[PDB]
RNA sequence: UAACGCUGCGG
RNA sequence: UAACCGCAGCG
């Protein structure tokens, strides 16, 4: 063998970095594409053996778009170096595009031997059927797709940008931009529920459970003459955010997430139907908030599909009821939705659904709670 | 003489101001221009006669833009009030586009008792040749072109919103895109300065002065093989922003609205040199501002020619050296200086320039003083 | 900020 | 946020 230097990488100033991973989603006025590539071997615990930035205009013929450089590159490095296992990181500020993605989908059918994750900062035409049927591409072809988070942009920073020892400061609402990019990449992708992830968070037995946790399924509908008609592309499911001092930190819970993520698909004047099925009922602040959605948008249906009845310390009726007086259509998930997510938002392998015990008892007593709940009169 | 009622304004809500109105200069996303006119008669001491609000797209076809619906509604309205002197006002989101611009100066000509008075939120693609040539067509015809501030927005907010008794709130900015636009303006609009506020200001006698204020003529040239050559359109001048509660709560130098104005004008990588001629030298935290300028501005040449040295209740000796240790050039105004400004910024009105009393001697002094200053010694 | 630019046809 | 949209050729 003949050795090659590792090439200590060439950094770009601060401001570049800042203005070009800044991960608004809709973000005007960047024309290049950034791209920090390290190439590890299988031992994580052994320092990385190369790293390389290119960049490029997003102009069409993708022979110039940074995507196909390092495919150049790293094709020239591989029959430079040892033969085994290697895996490829990218941290890039777009999304690829079609042409780039087939080029890369082919070189890891060429070379089995090379693991590739690719963590975007922002999506790259995310309501384009093309990009994201790009994202497709790379996610079958073996590609493990992420959203760049605070941690991958702290160790981007580190390790490509001309920081000269002083600490990544991270933006103005980097979290939130990360959530909303994080859902928008499920859907794409179309991620399925881990199943046993499924059996435990949405087992309707009253309270006998872990940590609490909110897991939120979501569908939309159109209307079409007195009669919904499914939308399959805004559909998913999301979970609390914990508290993170990078992230959100006291926490986001599921019904907020989800009611941020509502206006961000940019829907119609025509009546929707949004449907979620959660593990348990929205909380007293969750509530608030979805009655003021409710308040505030016009042409959106709520329906909630609870698994259980979260009791909040005591808020919970309070919550319920005006959630219930001020639009949303609140029922207890029988077992036809339980089989139906168990479809649809699990990665069920071709299993069909397997009814834990109790489940049309403990549906039943669930569905008197809540018309007990609600039919609570006042004054 | 049959009378017509007033026809009280049906208000748009508050979202729809709110998005519209906003006076970032650069905002996308809105594709309606609003405008809101009102008829008066000669008289600000008699209630307005009639407030009417029309709604338009953008794009082409004229026909429907929000200009040429007024000016229908409006010949309509003459032909059935009594013939006398009338002052239309406007506010406008969107600079208006060339052929309502000539529609309007045809309406003008055609109707000479009318004053019109447009104020703008925003300045429509004021890049665009065409645009500042329709701002210039209506300008000429006889319009007062202005910039909406902050007591025009309160008044539109109260004569044409569905504010519903709520007091108009102001947006993040409001100030700062407010110096911006009208700056862009007066260029656009190549206005010139009175010959009285130019002799009073611009007299390099010491200190002899009233409440004394500092404004700044500027011009840009660019380099093309060792000779400068004009830039006719970024050519203007400003004047220091006093402190406003609405506006800047403690004020801005006129120096530092110039530092924010280079950047807007969005200049190259080519070399440009940009020449100011302020009445006063720049206090220290203006040469504080314009040395951090010119140490981030690699293609930006500052030339500063001062009238008078600002005595800065100390610190002027240590201002004027920072900046000069620091890229900019300094001069103290001579004759030709003073006489190059009143060709071409002062609205001279065809008469020449008369230098008063003592102007050499004055120059000489203050070159004197300025040359002291910088060759002082450091340790 | 629905997100490279120029040149055009139309809505 | 250099700022209505679709279609079409090129950098
Ligand atoms: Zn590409
Ligand atoms: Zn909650
Ligand atoms: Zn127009
Ligand atoms: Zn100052």
């Not at 070009?20 to 052994?46: A, M, Q, Y």
Request: aromatic share 14%; hydrophobic share 35%.
């Amino acid at each position: 063998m003949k050795p090659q230097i590792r090439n200590m990488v060439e950094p770009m100033d601060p401001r570049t970095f800042v203005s070009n991973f800044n991960n608004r989603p809709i973000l005007s006025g960047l024309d290049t594409v950034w791209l920090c590539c390290e190439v590890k071997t299988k031992d994580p615990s052994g320092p990385p053996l190369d790293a390389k930035i290119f960049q490029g205009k997003v102009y069409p013929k993708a022979k110039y778009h940074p995507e196909m450089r390092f495919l150049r590159w790293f094709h020239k490095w591989r029959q430079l170096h040892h033969d085994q296992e290697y895996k490829v990181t990218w941290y890039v500020s777009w999304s690829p595009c079609t042409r780039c993605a087939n080029s890369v989908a082919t070189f890891l059918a060429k070379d089995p031997k090379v693991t590739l994750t690719i963590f975007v900062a922002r999506l790259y035409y995310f309501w384009d059927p093309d990009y994201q049927q790009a994202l497709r591409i790379l996610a079958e072809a073996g590609a493990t797709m992420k959203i760049m988070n605070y941690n991958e942009f702290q160790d981007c920073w580190n390790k490509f940008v001309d920081g000269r020892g002083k600490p990544f400061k991270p933006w103005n609402n980097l979290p939130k931009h990360y959530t909303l990019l994080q859902a928008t990449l499920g859907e794409l992708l179309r991620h399925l529920m881990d199943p046993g992830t499924f059996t435990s968070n949405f087992n309707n037995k009253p309270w006998v459970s872990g940590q609490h946790e909110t897991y939120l399924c979501y569908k939309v509908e159109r209307l079409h003459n007195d009669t919904w008609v499914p939308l399959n592309q805004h559909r998913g499911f999301l979970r609390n955010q914990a508290p993170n001092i990078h992230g959100f930190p006291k926490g986001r819970h599921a019904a907020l997430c989800f009611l941020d993520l509502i206006p961000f698909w940019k829907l119609d004047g025509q009546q929707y139907r949004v449907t979620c099925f959660t593990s348990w009922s929205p909380c007293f602040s969750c509530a608030q908030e979805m009655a003021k959605f409710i308040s505030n948008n016009e042409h959106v249906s709520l329906c909630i599909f609870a698994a259980r009845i979260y009791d909040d310390q005591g808020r919970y009726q309070e919550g319920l009821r005006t959630l219930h007086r001020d639009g949303a259509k609140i029922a207890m998930m029988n077992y036809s939705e339980f089989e139906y997510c168990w479809d649809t938002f699990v990665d069920r392998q071709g299993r069909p659904f397997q009814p834990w015990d109790g489940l049309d008892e403990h549906s039943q007593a669930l569905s008197g709670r809540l018309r007990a709940i609600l039919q609570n009169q006042g004054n």
